[PDB]
A = this chain, B = another copy of it.
Amino acid sequence: DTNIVTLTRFVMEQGRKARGTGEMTQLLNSLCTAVKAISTAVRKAGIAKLDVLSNDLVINVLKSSFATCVLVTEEDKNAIIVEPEKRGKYVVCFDPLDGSSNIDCLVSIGTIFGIYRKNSTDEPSEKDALQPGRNLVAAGYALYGSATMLVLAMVNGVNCFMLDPAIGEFILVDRNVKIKKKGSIYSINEGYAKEFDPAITEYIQRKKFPPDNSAPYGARYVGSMVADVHRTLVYGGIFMYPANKKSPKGKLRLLYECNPMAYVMEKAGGLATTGKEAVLDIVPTDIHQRAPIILGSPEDVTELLEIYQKHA
Protein backbone atom coordinates (compact mmCIF):
# COMPACT_ATOMS: atom_id res chain seq x y z
CA ASP A 1 0.00 0.00 0.00
CA THR A 2 1.70 3.30 -1.01
CA ASN A 3 0.92 5.24 2.12
CA ILE A 4 1.56 2.55 4.61
CA VAL A 5 1.29 4.04 8.08
CA THR A 6 4.03 2.28 10.01
CA LEU A 7 4.50 2.05 13.76
CA THR A 8 7.51 4.25 13.45
CA ARG A 9 5.53 6.77 11.28
CA PHE A 10 2.76 6.63 13.81
CA VAL A 11 5.01 7.09 16.89
CA MET A 12 7.00 9.92 15.35
CA GLU A 13 3.87 11.78 14.43
CA GLN A 14 2.43 11.58 18.00
CA GLY A 15 5.94 12.55 19.36
CA ARG A 16 6.07 15.81 17.33
CA LYS A 17 3.02 16.84 19.33
CA ALA A 18 4.99 16.51 22.63
CA ARG A 19 7.71 18.75 21.22
CA GLY A 20 10.19 16.18 22.30
CA THR A 21 13.68 14.76 21.71
CA GLY A 22 12.65 11.94 19.38
CA GLU A 23 13.85 9.28 21.89
CA MET A 24 10.45 7.42 22.24
CA THR A 25 10.64 7.03 18.55
CA GLN A 26 14.28 5.75 18.77
CA LEU A 27 13.37 3.42 21.62
CA LEU A 28 10.32 1.94 20.09
CA ASN A 29 12.07 1.79 16.75
CA SER A 30 14.79 -0.24 18.27
CA LEU A 31 12.37 -2.27 20.24
CA CYS A 32 10.77 -3.39 17.04
CA THR A 33 14.09 -4.78 15.74
CA ALA A 34 14.24 -7.14 18.76
CA VAL A 35 10.61 -8.13 18.12
CA LYS A 36 11.12 -9.07 14.40
CA ALA A 37 14.28 -11.01 15.13
CA ILE A 38 12.58 -12.91 17.95
CA SER A 39 9.45 -13.47 15.84
CA THR A 40 11.60 -15.05 13.19
CA ALA A 41 13.53 -17.01 15.78
CA VAL A 42 10.28 -18.58 16.92
CA ARG A 43 8.75 -19.29 13.49
CA LYS A 44 11.64 -21.78 12.87
CA ALA A 45 12.61 -22.56 16.48
CA GLY A 46 12.28 -26.20 15.99
CA ILE A 47 14.24 -26.77 12.76
CA ALA A 48 17.82 -27.98 13.68
CA LYS A 49 17.23 -20.95 26.34
CA LEU A 50 15.54 -19.02 23.43
CA ASP A 51 14.96 -16.63 26.26
CA VAL A 52 18.63 -15.81 26.35
CA LEU A 53 18.96 -14.82 22.64
CA SER A 54 15.72 -12.81 23.17
CA ASN A 55 17.10 -11.16 26.34
CA ASP A 56 20.49 -10.37 24.98
CA LEU A 57 18.69 -9.06 21.89
CA VAL A 58 16.41 -6.67 23.73
CA ILE A 59 19.17 -5.33 25.92
CA ASN A 60 21.43 -4.58 23.06
CA VAL A 61 18.78 -2.91 20.97
CA LEU A 62 17.74 -0.78 23.91
CA LYS A 63 21.30 0.23 24.79
CA SER A 64 21.99 1.31 21.25
CA SER A 65 18.74 3.24 21.12
CA PHE A 66 20.56 6.06 22.93
CA ALA A 67 17.21 6.49 24.73
CA THR A 68 17.39 4.41 27.92
CA CYS A 69 19.27 4.37 31.20
CA VAL A 70 17.81 1.57 33.34
CA LEU A 71 16.45 -1.68 31.94
CA VAL A 72 14.79 -4.30 34.26
CA THR A 73 14.38 -7.86 32.93
CA GLU A 74 12.52 -11.11 33.99
CA GLU A 75 15.82 -12.74 33.20
CA ASP A 76 18.52 -10.75 35.16
CA LYS A 77 19.22 -10.38 38.89
CA ASN A 78 19.77 -6.67 39.12
CA ALA A 79 18.69 -3.85 36.88
CA ILE A 80 20.84 -2.75 33.95
CA ILE A 81 22.27 0.73 34.08
CA VAL A 82 23.15 2.14 30.75
CA GLU A 83 26.60 3.46 29.85
CA PRO A 84 26.64 7.34 29.85
CA GLU A 85 27.80 7.71 26.33
CA LYS A 86 24.63 5.87 25.41
CA ARG A 87 22.15 7.01 28.16
CA GLY A 88 18.72 8.65 27.59
CA LYS A 89 15.66 9.57 29.68
CA TYR A 90 13.73 6.26 29.63
CA VAL A 91 13.40 3.25 31.83
CA VAL A 92 12.07 -0.02 30.34
CA CYS A 93 10.97 -3.03 32.38
CA PHE A 94 10.48 -5.94 30.09
CA ASP A 95 9.95 -9.59 29.89
CA PRO A 96 11.58 -10.60 26.63
CA LEU A 97 9.67 -13.86 26.53
CA ASP A 98 6.72 -14.74 28.46
CA GLY A 99 5.40 -18.35 28.60
CA SER A 100 8.63 -19.70 27.05
CA SER A 101 8.06 -23.23 28.27
CA ASN A 102 4.99 -23.22 25.98
CA ILE A 103 6.92 -22.61 22.68
CA ASP A 104 7.18 -26.40 22.56
CA CYS A 105 3.44 -26.86 22.26
CA LEU A 106 3.20 -24.03 19.60
CA VAL A 107 1.41 -21.81 22.01
CA SER A 108 0.91 -18.20 21.06
CA ILE A 109 3.77 -16.41 23.11
CA GLY A 110 4.94 -12.74 23.57
CA THR A 111 7.37 -10.07 24.71
CA ILE A 112 5.99 -7.63 27.29
CA PHE A 113 7.49 -4.24 28.31
CA GLY A 114 6.67 -0.93 29.90
CA ILE A 115 8.43 2.35 29.60
CA TYR A 116 8.80 4.83 32.48
CA ARG A 117 10.60 8.14 32.40
CA LYS A 118 13.51 8.91 34.73
CA ASN A 119 12.21 12.05 36.53
CA SER A 120 14.90 12.40 39.33
CA THR A 121 18.20 14.31 39.23
CA ASP A 122 20.80 11.61 40.30
CA GLU A 123 22.73 8.47 39.22
CA PRO A 124 20.15 6.24 37.44
CA SER A 125 19.40 3.30 39.71
CA GLU A 126 16.72 0.50 40.34
CA LYS A 127 14.72 2.98 42.42
CA ASP A 128 13.99 4.79 39.21
CA ALA A 129 12.20 1.49 38.29
CA LEU A 130 10.20 1.56 41.53
CA GLN A 131 7.40 3.76 40.21
CA PRO A 132 3.69 2.70 40.22
CA GLY A 133 2.43 1.51 36.85
CA ARG A 134 0.12 4.56 36.95
CA ASN A 135 3.07 6.65 35.89
CA LEU A 136 3.92 4.78 32.71
CA VAL A 137 4.28 6.90 29.68
CA ALA A 138 4.03 3.94 27.27
CA ALA A 139 3.18 0.19 27.35
CA GLY A 140 2.10 -2.74 25.18
CA TYR A 141 3.33 -6.16 24.12
CA ALA A 142 4.23 -8.20 21.09
CA LEU A 143 2.42 -11.47 20.38
CA TYR A 144 3.91 -14.32 18.32
CA GLY A 145 0.90 -16.38 17.14
CA SER A 146 -0.46 -16.88 13.61
CA ALA A 147 0.76 -13.37 12.90
CA THR A 148 3.15 -11.15 14.88
CA MET A 149 1.20 -8.31 16.51
CA LEU A 150 2.18 -5.38 18.63
CA VAL A 151 -0.35 -3.57 20.66
CA LEU A 152 1.00 -0.27 21.97
CA ALA A 153 -0.81 1.74 24.50
CA MET A 154 0.28 5.36 24.99
CA VAL A 155 -1.23 8.40 26.66
CA ASN A 156 -3.82 8.74 23.80
CA GLY A 157 -4.95 5.18 23.23
CA VAL A 158 -4.38 1.58 22.57
CA ASN A 159 -3.56 0.66 18.96
CA CYS A 160 -2.57 -2.57 17.22
CA PHE A 161 0.09 -2.77 14.60
CA MET A 162 0.59 -6.13 12.78
CA LEU A 163 3.95 -7.03 11.38
CA ASP A 164 3.81 -7.19 7.54
CA PRO A 165 6.43 -9.92 6.99
CA ALA A 166 6.79 -9.07 3.35
CA ILE A 167 8.41 -5.74 4.27
CA GLY A 168 9.62 -6.00 7.87
CA GLU A 169 7.32 -3.24 9.10
CA PHE A 170 4.71 -2.91 11.69
CA ILE A 171 1.62 -1.67 10.06
CA LEU A 172 -1.26 -0.02 12.02
CA VAL A 173 -4.45 -2.06 11.69
CA ASP A 174 -6.56 -1.32 14.78
CA ARG A 175 -7.07 2.15 16.11
CA ASN A 176 -8.10 3.58 19.42
CA VAL A 177 -9.10 0.25 20.72
CA LYS A 178 -11.80 0.12 23.41
CA ILE A 179 -12.87 -3.07 25.28
CA LYS A 180 -16.49 -4.27 25.44
CA LYS A 181 -18.24 -3.45 28.73
CA LYS A 182 -19.27 -7.04 29.55
CA GLY A 183 -18.50 -10.22 27.64
CA SER A 184 -19.08 -13.93 27.62
CA ILE A 185 -15.64 -15.40 28.64
CA TYR A 186 -13.72 -16.06 31.71
CA SER A 187 -10.12 -17.10 31.83
CA ILE A 188 -8.37 -18.64 34.88
CA ASN A 189 -6.23 -21.74 35.70
CA GLU A 190 -9.01 -24.00 36.92
CA GLY A 191 -6.60 -26.74 38.04
CA TYR A 192 -5.79 -24.53 41.02
CA ALA A 193 -9.47 -24.91 42.10
CA LYS A 194 -8.55 -26.22 45.55
CA GLU A 195 -6.43 -23.21 46.15
CA PHE A 196 -8.81 -20.38 45.05
CA ASP A 197 -10.08 -17.94 47.66
CA PRO A 198 -13.91 -17.60 48.26
CA ALA A 199 -14.73 -14.55 46.16
CA ILE A 200 -13.28 -16.14 43.07
CA THR A 201 -14.77 -19.55 43.57
CA GLU A 202 -18.23 -17.98 44.10
CA TYR A 203 -17.86 -15.85 40.98
CA ILE A 204 -16.74 -18.98 39.06
CA GLN A 205 -19.96 -20.61 40.07
CA ARG A 206 -21.97 -17.42 39.37
CA LYS A 207 -20.74 -17.73 35.80
CA LYS A 208 -20.83 -21.50 35.29
CA PHE A 209 -24.36 -22.07 36.49
CA PRO A 210 -25.69 -18.48 36.22
CA PRO A 211 -28.65 -18.02 38.63
CA ASP A 212 -30.38 -15.84 35.87
CA ASN A 213 -31.63 -18.69 33.41
CA SER A 214 -29.32 -17.03 30.90
CA ALA A 215 -26.41 -18.65 28.99
CA PRO A 216 -23.33 -19.59 31.11
CA TYR A 217 -20.04 -17.93 30.33
CA GLY A 218 -17.54 -19.70 28.14
CA ALA A 219 -14.09 -20.54 29.57
CA ARG A 220 -10.76 -20.25 27.85
CA TYR A 221 -7.19 -20.42 29.09
CA VAL A 222 -4.23 -20.72 26.69
CA GLY A 223 -1.73 -20.67 29.71
CA SER A 224 0.33 -17.91 28.11
CA MET A 225 -0.60 -14.61 29.71
CA VAL A 226 -0.21 -12.66 26.48
CA ALA A 227 -2.60 -14.74 24.42
CA ASP A 228 -5.25 -14.62 27.05
CA VAL A 229 -4.95 -10.87 27.61
CA HIS A 230 -5.04 -10.13 23.89
CA ARG A 231 -8.12 -12.36 23.52
CA THR A 232 -9.67 -10.44 26.50
CA LEU A 233 -8.89 -7.01 24.93
CA VAL A 234 -10.48 -8.01 21.70
CA TYR A 235 -13.32 -10.43 22.25
CA GLY A 236 -13.95 -8.93 25.70
CA GLY A 237 -14.30 -11.01 28.88
CA ILE A 238 -12.17 -11.59 32.01
CA PHE A 239 -8.88 -13.07 32.93
CA MET A 240 -7.71 -13.93 36.29
CA TYR A 241 -4.68 -15.00 37.94
CA PRO A 242 -5.42 -14.77 41.65
CA ALA A 243 -3.28 -15.06 44.81
CA ASN A 244 -3.78 -18.57 46.22
CA LYS A 245 -2.07 -21.30 48.42
CA LYS A 246 0.71 -22.15 45.96
CA SER A 247 1.51 -18.50 45.42
CA PRO A 248 -0.03 -16.12 48.01
CA LYS A 249 1.30 -13.16 45.95
CA GLY A 250 0.06 -14.13 42.51
CA LYS A 251 2.51 -15.74 40.09
CA LEU A 252 2.78 -12.81 37.67
CA ARG A 253 5.48 -10.31 38.28
CA LEU A 254 4.32 -6.70 38.55
CA LEU A 255 6.73 -4.36 36.77
CA TYR A 256 7.04 -6.46 33.61
CA GLU A 257 3.98 -8.69 33.45
CA CYS A 258 1.08 -7.14 35.37
CA ASN A 259 1.52 -3.31 35.04
CA PRO A 260 1.84 -3.23 31.09
CA MET A 261 -1.29 -5.34 30.70
CA ALA A 262 -3.00 -3.33 33.44
CA TYR A 263 -2.14 -0.08 31.60
CA VAL A 264 -3.17 -1.39 28.20
CA MET A 265 -6.43 -2.60 29.82
CA GLU A 266 -7.41 0.56 31.61
CA LYS A 267 -6.57 2.74 28.60
CA ALA A 268 -8.77 0.44 26.62
CA GLY A 269 -11.56 1.12 29.09
CA GLY A 270 -11.02 -2.12 31.07
CA LEU A 271 -10.10 -2.47 34.67
CA ALA A 272 -7.36 -4.28 36.41
CA THR A 273 -7.21 -4.86 40.05
CA THR A 274 -5.77 -7.25 42.59
CA GLY A 275 -9.25 -7.54 44.13
CA LYS A 276 -8.15 -5.29 47.00
CA GLU A 277 -6.57 -2.47 44.93
CA ALA A 278 -5.70 -1.29 41.43
CA VAL A 279 -2.61 -2.85 39.92
CA LEU A 280 -1.26 0.43 38.67
CA ASP A 281 -1.72 2.27 41.97
CA ILE A 282 0.67 -0.26 43.61
CA VAL A 283 4.02 1.15 44.57
CA PRO A 284 6.80 -1.48 43.76
CA THR A 285 9.26 -2.19 46.51
CA ASP A 286 11.07 -4.95 44.68
CA ILE A 287 11.62 -4.65 41.02
CA HIS A 288 10.86 -8.36 40.83
CA GLN A 289 7.72 -8.34 43.00
CA ARG A 290 4.51 -10.17 42.04
CA ALA A 291 0.83 -9.33 42.17
CA PRO A 292 -2.64 -10.84 41.97
CA ILE A 293 -4.21 -9.90 38.57
CA ILE A 294 -7.88 -9.78 37.54
CA LEU A 295 -8.28 -7.77 34.33
CA GLY A 296 -10.94 -7.45 31.72
CA SER A 297 -14.19 -5.92 30.45
CA PRO A 298 -15.12 -3.52 33.22
CA GLU A 299 -18.57 -4.81 34.36
CA ASP A 300 -17.36 -8.33 34.82
CA VAL A 301 -14.31 -7.32 36.91
CA THR A 302 -16.57 -5.08 38.95
CA GLU A 303 -18.89 -8.01 39.48
CA LEU A 304 -15.89 -9.73 41.06
CA LEU A 305 -14.75 -6.68 43.04
CA GLU A 306 -18.23 -6.52 44.62
CA ILE A 307 -17.94 -10.24 45.37
CA TYR A 308 -14.54 -9.51 46.91
CA GLN A 309 -15.80 -7.05 49.51
CA LYS A 310 -19.26 -8.74 49.73
CA HIS A 311 -17.15 -11.51 51.35
CA ALA A 312 -15.42 -8.89 53.59
Contacts and interface: CB of A to CB of B under 8 A. Distances in A.
Interface string A122-149: 0000000000000000000001111111
A295 interface: no
A9 interface: yes
Interface stretch (A189-197, A255-263, A265-273, A275-283): A189-197
Given A106-B149, A108-B107, A168 B167 contact: yes
A181 interface: no
Contacts of A3: 60
Contacts of A30: 8-9
Contacts of A235: 104-105
A2 interface: yes
A310 interface: no
B219 A220 contact: no
A264 to B, nearest CB: 15
Contacts of A208: 190-191, 193-194
A79 interface: no
A208 B190 CA distance: 7
B167 A40 contact: yes
Contacts of A216: 191-195
Interface stretch (A68-76, A112-120, A226-234, A284-292): A226-234
Interface string A39-69: 1101111111000010011011100101000
A60 B231 CA distance: 33
How many monomers of this protein are in the complex? 4
A145 B145 contact: yes
B57 A2 contact: yes
Nearest to A162: B46
A278 to B, nearest CB: 25
Contacts of A207: 191
A18 interface: no
Nearest to A170: B168
A90 B164 CA distance: 29
A144 B108 CA distance: 10
A174 B47 CA distance: 10
A169 interface: yes
